[PDB]
Design a protein around this ligand. Structure first.
Ligand SMILES: CO[P@](=O)(c1cc(C)cc(CCC#N)c1)c1c(C(N)=O)[nH]c2ccc(Cl)cc12
Lengths: 550, 396
């Protein structure tokens, strides 16, 4: 069954002509099988015979499915126009609404039941070769959407939108979701009045030449879809199986990490950081990685979580969404979204920026923006947040910090570990405390740095450093100043780089030298830090500059 | 219809639709259904690969939703077509800004160019496919529209302009900038006369002379510490990269020696002589900085805390064409968004074009929240500075 729809006009890419690919010679076994199929396809009206006037040709093959024809449209696809993105995203189950009855209508022969544009049909020409290339081969062209052509998925999906437009307008109560070939139809009508409206839609599908499974459907709830299990009043991921291994290859760990990540959208508190660390470096796919004591402990915690099957609920438009985030350590965060306390719609997780220096207050904000965007996409609205940070802690951060930063309606929730800043740099220079003028130099050719300080109380130090840079020496000088100073201290650097790092109050870093300076900053009672421009005859900076210059 | 062509080699825009809230998708469907009935926009099939973004906003002090198509990418790829601004406009006492975007809907758009104006209303959770539309009329927010319409706009104002040869009228995007040296009540009456001229072709206050530099002010203390001088030297040091006459050789002599930060340091006769010399050079303008129309305007903004923001417009760095402030609740993005619009508004009145903002905020946060406080018919180019400057102190 073809279909009486208006065709979508199609063009080739500007400048380009259609495909003129040579037909490779085939065995007699393949040629025979292709004739049998193309006769069947011709009788059903999918293809049509043509003469040798049509100058275009796309090759054809035959494989053992039972023979199944196979056209290679690689060349036509290049020359065919670009089309509109079939999907800007796939729906998440948590964004779906609860329905009484749910039915899955599979269109089946989807692409083959929609007409191809009259003016484009000529380009879909292919040839069945003769026996060892004796006579001219039989020539066909498509009157419908071929399999594997660039514009089939777009053109089919537009036809469905058109075909439903009358039915959706006439039946605003029921809801039909389009995915590829399938139509998922749901309603809050009775099992009698639902089954009738299914047959109206199945009849409506037939009115525009689309077949569909009868009352003896192929599937019924719960459905398996995109790696989910969709029940009528709940959802969950499909059965996760974390394998048992003596030895783990990379390939096994990647699939493990993937499955754990997949699970994380309903199973709360899944962690994958220690497993992911192992994947750093190269090795092959079959190279065995012995698991660290952390990764063994991490994988053990995931097995525990997955033991008891957890399910997600559906969206109620009337009620508010409540997002709620926890801290797991090593810059790992987990969240849950619900509407009625602890009946989760979904869960998830946020991972630290593997790069740069940061703190908990920054991370919590980055995790809010992730979760906010997720909610705009899934539910069309921002959820109300419940965070482990005092309003006094957040107030102290946003007012002082250089970036613009904002988080919507939120409340404190006392769930340790709680987010805090672990130190504060002084507003004004400390009286009765030493003043360490610091600088770092480094030779560009030899990579031989010197780092050190000079103080108001006389003192000096100059440490030599191998295989380093100007940046690393100026951080090393600030570290030195903290080491040889008391509980209070003043520090004068000429490194905007180090000011910029340290003023932003990191409590965590990749650079180990920065982790040392952080450790110092937390011990101290009071630290003050100021900047001067280098090479200006500024006292203290001028002295220490010459110590390191040698 | 006037025929329109893209730059040679450049294909049309293919920008992704930013996800929208429930209220905005519903508001956009109300709007886009009426525009379809009135012929302004038509549905489109999947043969159109092109796409421009779209969101809903509310114009200055209004409750009704208004459509805002983000034609920045299409504008970039069309500028051979469109690309003078009157220098007198910035020297007016009062400048009023009138939205004349509804004028464009009467004129039809070239049938062949209609493909490039495609846009998508996205659905929540992608449950339905996106509602696609292309423009049949000159669209609002496309720079081609005022250019095409300019011949018609000159004709509408030809009476009013002959009537009042002192009134400077200028046009950028969908707005009309009307400036005069008149009294504000007299001015307002000329604006009301102008509304009436526009009413016959389908059409239903800032003070540029009062914009002055926010100079790099230096402190004034009763006594000075080492730290206070060290910061003061840095401010002048950095200011000397912009300003020609700056020097601080006598100042740095006061610091010579490894002194503590809180130790007090008396100023010499030459130091206060040099310090005053700096002040008065910094109060007055920058020599040798002029607007080049070929090169881009840039805008940097710094957060000062307590609802205070500072900004600088320039073309070549450390050569400021304009500096300024923005003041006045606890939302940072809101205020930054209110600042961005204000700065652009000025830039359009002075040079006739918008600046590229260097916004001090994470891309994602801004991208999410900017439309919730945006009110203008235009949108400028932005990039995101995630580097923490020391410049916060220099413009305080
Ligand atoms: C009527 O089906 P839906 O459109 C639907 C949506 C998606 C993204 C996937 C599926 C897959 C079904 C299979 N296999 C159904 C739907 C919705 C909805 N869109 O509101 N709500 C539901 C509740 C339970 C179930 Cl099993 C399905 C749905």
């Amino acid at each position: 069954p073809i279909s009486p729809i208006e065709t979508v006009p199609v063009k080739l890419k500007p400048g380009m002509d259609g495909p003129k690919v040579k037909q490779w010679p085939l065995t007699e076994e393949k040629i025979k099988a292709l004739v049998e199929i193309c006769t069947e396809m011709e009788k059903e009206g999918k293809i049509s015979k043509i003469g040798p006037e049509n100058p275009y040709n796309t090759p054809v093959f035959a494989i053992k499915k039972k023979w199944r024809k196979l056209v290679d449209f690689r060349e036509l696809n290049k020359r065919t126009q670009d089309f509109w993105e079939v999907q800007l995203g796939i729906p998440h189950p948590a964004g779906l609404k609860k329905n009484k009855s749910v039915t899955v209508l599979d269109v089946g022969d989807a692409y083959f039941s929609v007409p191809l544009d009259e003016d484009f049909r000529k380009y879909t020409a292919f040839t069945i070769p003769s026996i060892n290339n004796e006579t001219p081969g039989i020539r066909y062209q498509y009157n419908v959407l071929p399999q594997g052509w660039k514009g089939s998925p777009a053109i089919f999906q537009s036809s469905m939108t058109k075909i439903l437009e009358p039915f959706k307008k006439q039946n605003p109560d029921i809801v039909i979701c389009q995915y590829m070939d399938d139509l998922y139809v749901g309603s809050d009508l009775e099992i009698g009045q639902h089954r009738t409206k299914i047959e109206e839609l199945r009849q409506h599908l037939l009115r525009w030449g689309l077949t569909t499974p009868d009352k003896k459907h192929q599937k019924e709830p719960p459905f398996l879809w995109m790696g989910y299990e969709l029940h009528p009043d709940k959802w969950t991921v499909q059965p996760i199986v974390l394998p048992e291994k003596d030895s783990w290859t990379v390939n096994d760990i990647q699939k493990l990490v993937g499955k754990l990540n997949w699970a994380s959208q309903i199973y709360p508190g899944i962690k994958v950081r220690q497993l992911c660390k192992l994947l750093r470096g190269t090795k092959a796919l079959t190279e065995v990685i012995p698991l660290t004591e952390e990764a063994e402990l991490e994988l053990a915690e995931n097995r525990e979580i997955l033991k008891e099957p957890v399910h997600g609920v559906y969206y109620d438009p009337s009620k508010d969404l409540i997002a709620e985030i926890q801290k797991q350590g090593q810059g790992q965060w987990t969240y849950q979204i619900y509407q009625e306390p602890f009946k989760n719609l979904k869960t998830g997780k946020y991972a630290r920026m593997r790069g740069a220096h940061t703190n908990d207050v920054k991370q919590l904000t980055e995790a809010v923006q992730k979760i906010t965007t997720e909610s705009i996409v899934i539910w069309g609205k921002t959820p109300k947040f419940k965070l482990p940070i005092q309003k006094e802690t957040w107030e102290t951060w946003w007012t002082e910090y250089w970036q613009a930063t904002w988080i919507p309606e939120w409340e404190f929730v006392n769930t340790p570990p709680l987010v805090k800043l672990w130190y504060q740099l002084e507003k004004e220079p400390i009286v009765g405390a030493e003043t360490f003028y610091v600088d770092g130099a480094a030779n560009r050719e030899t990579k031989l740095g010197k780092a050190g300080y000079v103080t108001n109380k006389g003192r000096q130090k100059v440490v030599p450093l191998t295989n380093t840079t100007n940046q690393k020496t100026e951080l090393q000088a600030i570290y030195l100043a903290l080491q040889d100073s008391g509980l209070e201290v003043n520090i004068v650097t000429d490194s905007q780089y180090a000011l910029g790092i340290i003023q932003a109050q990191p409590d965590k870093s990749e650079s180990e030298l920065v982790n040392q300076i952080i450790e110092q900053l937390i011990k101290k009672e009071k630290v003050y830090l100021a900047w001067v421009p280098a090479h200006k005859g500024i006292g203290g900076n001028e002295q220490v500059d010459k110590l390191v210059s040698a | 219809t006037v025929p329109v062509k893209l730059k040679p080699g450049m294909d049309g825009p293919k920008v992704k639709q930013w996800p929208l809230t429930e209220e905005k998708i519903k508001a956009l469907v109300e709007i886009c259904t009426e525009m379809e009935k009135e012929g302004k926009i038509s549905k489109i099939g999947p043969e159109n690969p092109y796409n421009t973004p779209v969101f809903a906003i509310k114009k200055k002090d209004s409750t009704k939703w208004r459509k805002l198509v983000d034609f920045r990418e299409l504008n970039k790829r069309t500028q051979d077509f469109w690309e003078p601004h009157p220098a007198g406009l910035k020297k007016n006492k009062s400048v009023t800004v009138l939205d004349v975007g509804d004028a464009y809907f009467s004129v039809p758009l070239d049938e062949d160019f209609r493909k490039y104006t495609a846009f998508t209303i996205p659905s929540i959770n992608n449950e339905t496919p996106g509602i696609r539309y292309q423009y049949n009329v000159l669209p609002q927010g496309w720079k081609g529209s005022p250019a095409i319409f300019q011949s018609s706009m000159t004709k509408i104002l030809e009476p009013f302009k002959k009537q009042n040869p002192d009134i400077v009228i200028c046009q950028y995007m969908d707005d009309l900038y009307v400036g005069s040296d008149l009294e504000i009540g007299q001015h307002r009456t000329k604006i009301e006369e102008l509304r009436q001229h526009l009413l016959r072709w389908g059409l239903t206050e800032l003070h540029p002379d009062k914009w002055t530099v926010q100079p790099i002010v230096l402190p004034e203390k009763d006594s000075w510490t080492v730290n206070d001088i060290q910061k003061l030297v840095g401010k002048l040091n950095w200011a000397s990269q912009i300003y020609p006459g700056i020097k601080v050789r006598q100042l740095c002599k006061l610091l010579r020696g490894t002194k503590a930060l809180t130790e007090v340091i008396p100023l010499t006769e030459e130091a206060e002589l040099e310090l005053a010399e700096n002040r008065e050079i910094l109060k007055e303008p920058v020599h040798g900085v002029y607007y080049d129309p070929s090169k881009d305007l840039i805008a940097e903004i710094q957060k000062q805390g307590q609802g205070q923001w500072t900004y600088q417009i320039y073309q070549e760095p450390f050569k400021n064409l304009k500096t300024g402030k923005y003041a006045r609740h606890t939302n940072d993005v809101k205020q930054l968004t209110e600042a961005v619009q204000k700065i652009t508004t000025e830039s359009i009145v002075i040079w006739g074009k918008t600046p590229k903002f260097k916004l001090p905020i994470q891309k994602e946060t801004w991208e999410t929240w900017w439309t919730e406080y945006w009110q203008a018919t235009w949108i400028p180019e932005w990039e995101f500075v995630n580097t923490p400057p020391l410049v916060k102190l220099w413009y305080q």
